């Protein structure tokens, strides 16, 4: 699915990288409309995966805390590292992933069913 920014515009990779500083984590509309983080890597390239921002506890949207490099849920305090791996409950699972690719200049999110690269476990979201 083509990623859309907060204003409803398709995310055009080359343009996104001009206005989003390296290390940036900004929410976009991802698979099934779920808020998904598009991340600009250290070397000024888009990360190859998107992080679904829907908390695994009750579904609040988790913001990124740049100071601590953690996504911290304002609803009940669940914490996740910078790759979305769960670090503190009540959420029992890591934030879901999506593959991030570019098609005809547009950023597209695609389902992630391969091994959860963060732990070696099968993705819990793809069954
Ligand atoms: S909805 Fe995220 S801590 Fe409960």
From Swiss-Prot:
- Binding of [2Fe-2S] cluster, residues: 55, 57, 73, 76
Task: Give each disulfide bond as a residue pair.
Answer: 60-75
Where is the Rieske domain positioned along the sequence? 13-109
- What does this protein's record comment on cofactor binding? Binds 1 [2Fe-2S] cluster per subunit.
A single Gene Ontology CC term: chloroplast thylakoid membrane
Q: Which reaction does it catalyse?
A: 2 oxidized [plastocyanin] + a plastoquinol + 2 H(+)(in) = 2 reduced [plastocyanin] + a plastoquinone + 4 H(+)(out)
Cellular compartments annotated: Plastid, Chloroplast thylakoid membrane
The EC number(s) given in the record are: 7.1.1.6
Keywords in alphabetical order? 2Fe-2S, Chloroplast, Disulfide bond, Electron transport, Iron, Iron-sulfur, Membrane, Metal-binding, Plastid, Thylakoid, Transit peptide, Translocase, Transmembrane, Transmembrane helix, Transport
Query: How the protein sits in the membrane?
Result: Single-pass membrane protein
Keyword Nucleotide-binding present in the record's keywords: the answer is: no
State its cofactor.
[2Fe-2S] cluster
Q: What is its main location?
A: plastid
In Gene Ontology terms, what is one molecular function of this protein?
A: oxidoreductase activity
General remark: This protein is 1 of 2 subunits of the cytochrome b6-f complex that are encoded in the nucleus. The Rieske iron-sulfur protein is a high potential 2Fe-2S protein.
Subunit structure comment from the entry? The 4 large subunits of the cytochrome b6-f complex are cytochrome b6, subunit IV (17 kDa polypeptide, petD), cytochrome f and the Rieske protein, while the 4 small subunits are petG, petL, petM and petN. The complex functions as a dimer.
What's the family?
A: Belongs to the Rieske iron-sulfur protein family.
Q: What does this protein do?
A: Component of the cytochrome b6-f complex, which mediates electron transfer between photosystem II (PSII) and photosystem I (PSI), cyclic electron flow around PSI, and state transitions.
Q: What is this protein called?
A: Cytochrome b6-f complex iron-sulfur subunit, chloroplastic
What is the species of this protein?
Spinacia oleracea
What taxonomic classification does the UniProt entry list for its organism?
Answer: Eukaryota, Viridiplantae, Streptophyta, Embryophyta, Tracheophyta
């Amino acid at each position: 699915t083509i990623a859309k920014d907060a204003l409803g515009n398709d995310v055009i990779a080359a343009e996104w990288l001009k206005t989003h500083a390296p290390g940036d984590r900004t929410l976009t509309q991802g698979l099934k409309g779920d808020p998904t983080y598009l991340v600009v890597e250290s070397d000024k390239t888009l990360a190859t995966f998107g992080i679904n921002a829907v908390c695994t506890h009750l579904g609040c949207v988790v913001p990124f805390n740049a100071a601590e490099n953690k996504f911290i849920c304002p609803c009940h305090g669940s914490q996740y590292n910078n790759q979305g791996r769960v670090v503190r409950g009540p959420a029992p699972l890591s934030l879901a992933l999506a593959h991030c690719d570019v098609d005809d200049g547009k950023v597209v999110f695609v389902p992630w069913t391969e091994t959860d690269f963060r732990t070696g476990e099968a993705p819990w979201w793809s069954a």
